[PDB]
Every structure is written in structure tokens, then in C-alpha cells.
Design an enzyme around this catalytic site. Structure first.
Site, short mmCIF file in Angstrom:
data_model
loop_
_atom_site.label_atom_id
_atom_site.label_comp_id
_atom_site.label_asym_id
_atom_site.label_seq_id
_atom_site.Cartn_x
_atom_site.Cartn_y
_atom_site.Cartn_z
CG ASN A 11 11.82 71.48 55.65
OD1 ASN A 11 10.65 71.32 56.12
ND2 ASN A 11 12.77 70.58 55.68
CE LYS B 13 14.68 71.00 58.83
NZ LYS B 13 16.03 70.77 59.36
CG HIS C 285 14.86 66.83 55.21
ND1 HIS C 285 15.39 66.60 56.43
CD2 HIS C 285 15.08 68.13 54.90
CE1 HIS C 285 15.92 67.75 56.86
NE2 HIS C 285 15.72 68.72 55.97
CD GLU D 170 15.27 67.20 59.99
OE1 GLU D 170 14.09 67.39 59.65
OE2 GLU D 170 16.07 68.14 60.23
CD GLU E 195 18.86 68.06 53.70
OE1 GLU E 195 18.33 68.63 54.71
OE2 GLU E 195 18.59 66.88 53.39
N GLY F 285 20.81 72.73 61.54
CA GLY F 285 20.42 73.05 62.92
C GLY F 285 21.55 73.43 63.84
CB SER G 20 23.47 76.72 59.60
OG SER G 20 23.20 75.82 60.68
#
Lengths: 249, 249
Positions: free
Chosen positions: B10, B12, B94, B96, B166, B172, B212
């Protein structure tokens, strides 16, 4: 006297590779004999094909949205990605993003400021809904929207800004602003800019009308004093977009 | 036996044409000797380039988001447009987009069902935040997220679905979930699918871990019984993504 007009095609979330290729071929063949900036805002997926195929020198490509910075924003596209891709025009604050996708006056303003800082030409959109128009609040809504944009800019930035006034209630509803309605909205905007930002900026600023512009009604709107062109949705997917361009002579 | 693993990159909202083209060159030259579906989810702007350049038989391209239908949705890309463009995989829901872009459990579920109906392979993402984890609500949050997705699907549709769990508190932040944490979350998800949908579907479902994942920690995570591969953000922009692929055995 009027600044250079703009005819902006907002294809929205539409198109196939074949249908847009056919339309671009028509655009490339149009004979335009006055100074007008034509703009095609395709979906992000179609920017590659549109950049490659659109060759008429009076047309530029635009994006329909962005976020300010690259990073961990799954699904979004950033101004630096668009700049790397050779796209230097962008539509921001469109009424559908204000309604559907969380873009408050302040979020629009911050996107506009980021796009100007990056070097884009920006079509910043404002406009009132049916309920706002019917209850007498057009002026407070439109002025509040542009005041939020202005708050985040400096005077010299306005060379990179275009305002699109949308009669939101005209989009997809079989309504259209009358020439007097469009004129009165544009004149309000321009006068506010003159008084808040400067007479010089206000005279040079392009203010575009959006809301059911088509090949038949475009000239009667364009000939109003404070109309500098159009933000065109549905008719920009059609051959008559070239007639809208011609109406800005 | 575990089902076919997936290594999903991904990207992003990152990359230039050149930096991403260099990653594709690395992927194209990689030797992989086991069955693993590799997925490259780029921004919309970069799909044309990745479609043209990616040639490795174990890789497919994906989008990072969509809306269900074309129309008056300025700034968005729809499933029909992606289908016309030859994109058959998509990441939806996702973290986000759930956090920043208004995607509730129900909006995610409706996007997933629309993509499955349109013929896509779908990586549907779920997962709890730091506050949810610290509060002890991992189980109710994650089970409620998948239940919303499942409400809009039929049994046969699960052949087109992949779940990405996730650890949102690990996205991140460079501090991966331990093997035990990932395994326990994945086993909980599977137990739900087994009970609500069927033991057959559960055993075939890929449940991917995200948060991560990197070259150094991927193999140990993959050894867990209910881990079927990875949703990779930051490390997918780097050469070590190939080591994450190799770790799926």
C-alpha cells in the site's frame, strides 16, 4: 474591461478511456480565435490519457481535488504528486466535496492556500444551496465562504486564484441561474474582493458561473458584466462544450 | 494447509513517477519460488504507469479506494472507471479512511459489497485504535467491523474477499504487533467467520496483518497459524518489500 475568460470542463466522476478519447478528439479540432483558457479536469485515473491525447494549445489539464501533502493518506492524491505529474491547475472546494466529503470552509481554504504555495492555478469553488437561496442567505453564505479563503491568502496570491460561483441548486435539477442572478452573485463577490483585498485584484479576478451551463444558455450568461466564464459539469462531457467556449468571445 | 498468502504493497499517498517506476523495476526482476499473490496499490494517478510497467506474473495492480457508481462526485473515482481501466483489486476501509474520510462500518461494508458485485478482488480492512486496545475493546470493535461487512455479502462472495487486520496503533509507528498479538487478533476474526459464515469459508480466507511490517519482522509473523500475509505501508516503498514477499513461507 474583462480579464481572459475561462471555460472549465469538470468531468466529475465520469468517463471511459474510449468515451473520453472520442471527446478529446473533438476538443482538439475546435477552432478558437479569441483569448480563452480552456481547462479539462478529468478523474485522477484519466489524467495520464488526457495529458497524452489533449493537444489543443488553448487547453490545460486539471485535477478535481487533492490533499496538501504526501504521506499516510490511503486513497488520496497530494499536490506534490500532481505537480510531479505535470498538472498545474486544480479545482478545489467543489460543492459536492463540501456536501459529501467533509470540506468545511476552512478545509477548502487551507487546500487552496497549499495549492497556491505549490504553484498551482486554482479554481476555488463557492456557492449556496436551494435552502440558503430561498431563505435570503445567499450573500452571507457566499461571503463567508470567500472570507475563509481570503483569510489564508496574501494579496499577491490572487494572481493564481479563480473563483467559481456555483448555484448549487441548479446542479442536476433542471434549474439554471438567470443572467441577473448570476450577475448579482458575481458582482457581490467582486465587490467584496475589491474592498477586502484591493481594486486591482478585483478587476483582474476571474469569476466563473456553474450550474446547468449548456451550449444554448452560455452566451446569455457570459455577456453579463461580472461573468468571466464557466465551470461546466454535464455539458463538458458533450460536443457542445465547444459552443460554451465560443460563448466567451 | 494455509491458503495462498498475499503480500500487499500500500504505497498510500506517496511517490513520484520515477521513484515508483524504480520500485516496479525491482519487483519485475525479483525471483519468487512459491505461490504468493503480490499486490501493488498505487495512487490513482500512478495506475497508468504501473499497468504499463509491472510485468511480473505474481503481481497485480490495485486501487486504494473507490466509490460505488460514476456520476456527480467531483474528486472521486468509481468502480466502473477502475473496471474500464483494467484494475481488478482494491483496498477498502483502510484505517486512514475510517479515521479521516468519514468511512463508518456501514460505508465500508457498502463499498466492499459494491466492489464484489462489480467483479473485484477486495482487501477489506478492519482494526482497532490505541484507545480501543487500551480500553480492552479490541474484540467488540473488530468483530463489529467484520460483522458489518459480512451483513452485505453472501457465502459465495467470500472467495473474492481478503481481510486485512490493521493494528492501528502500529501503523507508521515502527513498533509492530508481537507474533502473539497478531495471532490472537487473526484467530478471533477467523472464529467469527467460522461461526457466522462457515468453517469452509474460514479455512480458505486470507487474513493479512498490517502495522509496521518490515523485512526483518515479517518471517516470524508469518509463522503464526492464522497469518496469511501482510498489508505493508512504509516498507512497501523500499527495496526490503521483496524480503517481505520471501517471508510468506
Amino acid at each position: 474591461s474583462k480579464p481572459q475568460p475561462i471555460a472549465a470542463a469538470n468531468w466529475k466522476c465520469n468517463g471511459s478511456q474510449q468515451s473520453l478519447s472520442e471527446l478529446i478528439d473533438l476538443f482538439n479540432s475546435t477552432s478558437i480565435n479569441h483569448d480563452v483558457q480552456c481547462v479539462v479536469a478529468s478523474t485522477f485515473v484519466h489524467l495520464a490519457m488526457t495529458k497524452e491525447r489533449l493537444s489543443h494549445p488553448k487547453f490545460v489539464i486539471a485535477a478535481q481535488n487533492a490533499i496538501a501533502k504526501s504521506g499516510a493518506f490511503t486513497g488520496e492524491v497530494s499536490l506534490p504528486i500532481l505537480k510531479d505529474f505535470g498538472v498545474n491547475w486544480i479545482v478545489l472546494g467543489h460543492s459536492e466535496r463540501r456536501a459529501y466529503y467533509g470540506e468545511t470552509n476552512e478545509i477548502v481554504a487551507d487546500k487552496v492556500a497549499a495549492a497556491v504555495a505549490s504553484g498551482f492555478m486554482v479554481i476555488a469553488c463557492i456557492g449556496e444551496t436551494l435552502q440558503e437561496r430561498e431563505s435570503g442567505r445567499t450573500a452571507v453564505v457566499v461571503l463567508t465562504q470567500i472570507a475563509a479563503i481570503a483569510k489564508k491568502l496574501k494579496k499577491a496570491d490572487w494572481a493564481k486564484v479563480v473563483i467559481a460561483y456555483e448555484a448549487v441548486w441548479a446542479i442536476g435539477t433542471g434549474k439554471v441561474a438567470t443572467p441577473q442572478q448570476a450577475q448579482e452573485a458575481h458582482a457581490l463577490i467582486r465587490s467584496w474582493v475589491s474592498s477586502k483585498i484591493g481594486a486591482d485584484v478585483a478587476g483582474e479576478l476571474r469569476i466563473l458561473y456553474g450550474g446547468s451551463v449548456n451550449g444554448k444558455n452560455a452566451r446569455t450568461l457570459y455577456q453579463q458584466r461580472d461573468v468571466n466564464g464557466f465551470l461546466v459539469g454535464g455539458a463538458s462531457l458533450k460536443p457542445e462544450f465547444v459552443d460554451i467556449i465560443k460563448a466567451t468571445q
